[PDB]
Amino acid sequence: SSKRSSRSVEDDKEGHLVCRIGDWLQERYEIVGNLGEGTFGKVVECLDHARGKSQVALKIIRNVGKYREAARLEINVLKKIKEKDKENKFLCVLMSDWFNFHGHMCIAFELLGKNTFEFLKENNFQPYPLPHVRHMAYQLCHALRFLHENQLTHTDLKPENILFVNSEFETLYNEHKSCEEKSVKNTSIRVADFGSATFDHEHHTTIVATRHYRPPEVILELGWAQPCDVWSIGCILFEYYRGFTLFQTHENREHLVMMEKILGPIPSHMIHRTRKQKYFYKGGLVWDENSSDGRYVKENCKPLKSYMLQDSLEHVQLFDLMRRMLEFDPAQRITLAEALLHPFFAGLTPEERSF
Numbered sequence: 001s002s003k004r005s006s007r008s009v010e011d012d013k014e015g016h017l018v019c020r021i022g023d024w025l026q027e028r029y030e031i032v033g034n035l036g037e038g039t040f041g042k043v044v045e046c047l048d049h050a051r052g053k054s055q056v057a058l059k060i061i062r063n064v065g066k067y068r069e070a071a072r073l074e075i076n077v078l079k080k081i082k083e084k085d086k087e088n089k090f091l092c093v094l095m096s097d098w099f100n101f102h103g104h105m106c107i108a109f110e111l112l113g114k115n116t117f118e119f120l121k122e123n124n125f126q127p128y129p130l131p132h133v134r135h136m137a138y139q140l141c142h143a144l145r146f147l148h149e150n151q152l153t154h155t156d157l158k159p160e161n162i163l164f165v166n167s168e169f170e171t172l173y174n175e176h177k178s179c180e181e182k183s184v185k186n187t188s189i190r191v192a193d194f195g196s197a198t199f200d201h202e203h204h205t206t207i208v209a210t211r212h213y214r215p216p217e218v219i220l221e222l223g224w225a226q227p228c229d230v231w232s233i234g235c236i237l238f239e240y241y242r243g244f245t246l247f248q249t250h251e252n253r254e255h256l257v258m259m260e261k262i263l264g265p266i267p268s269h270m271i272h273r274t275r276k277q278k279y280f281y282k283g284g285l286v287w288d289e290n291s292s293d294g295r296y297v298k299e300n301c302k303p304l305k306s307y308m309l310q311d312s313l314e315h316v317q318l319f320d321l322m323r324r325m326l327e328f329d330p331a332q333r334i335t336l337a338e339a340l341l342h343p344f345f346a347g348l349t350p351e352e353r354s355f
């Protein structure tokens with residue numbers, strides 16, 4: 001029952017709210033499922049009884065100062081998004097509620113489906129069809145162009161943070177002894193997890209983004225802003241298109257070498273300005289071509305265009321846009337306002353353009 005459950009409360013020794021499916025918060029939210037967990041706290045599915053038993057994802061943050069403070073910044077970002085998107089058309093998760101529950105910052109969102117990584121994984125890493133890549137690309141450019149116009153940078157764009165509104169799939173094939181081939185029915189997406197998002201005027205965390213989606217200006221500690229997100233989007237599109245990461249690495253020097261092999265030479269001014277001088281000698285990346293890693297990189301990391309699966313116009317257009325997103329110099333990198341005008345998006349329907 002709502003009133004009794006909501007007042008009966010304790011934490012565990014790590015500052016997690018002790019709760020289970022069936023518990024209530026705010027005499028309003030009934031926990032009905034688990035959605036995920038991290039060092040931050042937990043995400044639970046709730047029914048929102050004050051809004052017709054509608055389904056929400058509720059983030060319950062640990063009772064630890066560092067996480068509480070971080071969550072307040074996240075709420076500030078979500079408030080701005082909500083203030084600026086009155087028609088719910090810019091595709092960034094809209095926070096439906098937030099509150100402090102006995103020290104636990106709680107943030108409610110309308111419930112979405114599987115994220116784009118999980119869907120890819122459940123499709124045995126077989127890639128999204130080009131029209132799906134195109135529609136998702138358009139939506140990402142649209143969403144982040146909006147964020148960028150509001151002096152915000154997401155900083156942690158990755159397939160895990162892009163969620164389908166509805167992840168129901170169709171089966172294309174299911175042959176004996178092979179994985180089922182699946183396609184999502186509706187490619188409408190939302191950008192989630194504003195827990196790292198930063199306003200222009202705020203302290204900028206130095207090392208942002210998840211490895212694979214991290215731009216060279218971040219690795220080289222040259223300062224970052226909105227172009228960071230554009231690089232991440234380019235990496236995401238490649239991964240949607242091929243099903244594997246563009247930069248499968250876990251170390252800076254190797255990562256930079258991969259960038260050079262795939263994209264061309266790093267601009268000398270970026271090398272001249274980086275405090276990460278140890279990665280370079282006489283202006284060039286330190287790299288042994290003949291080592292085990294040298295061989296993996298030489299055999300696996302080829303010029304970007306080599307990864308095209310077809311030679312037709314729409315594929316060429318995708319790769320042109322991707323290369324513009326993957327410009328080394330963040331000052332030269334395409335902006336999302338410009339990306340939305342790219343000819344790759346001529347291939348959309350007057351339907352895929354409705355948000």
Ligand SMILES: CC(C)(C)c1ccc(C(=O)Nc2cn3cc(-c4cn[nH]c4)ccc3n2)cn1
Pocket residue numbers: 035043057059093109110111112113114115163167192193194
């Ligand atoms: C039925 C099945 C296909 C198994 C299913 C249903 C729901 C989910 C799910 O996980 N839904 C889900 C997670 N969410 C996280 C946020 C969020 C925003 N910022 N941070 C975190 C917002 C909405 C949101 N919805 C996954 N699978």
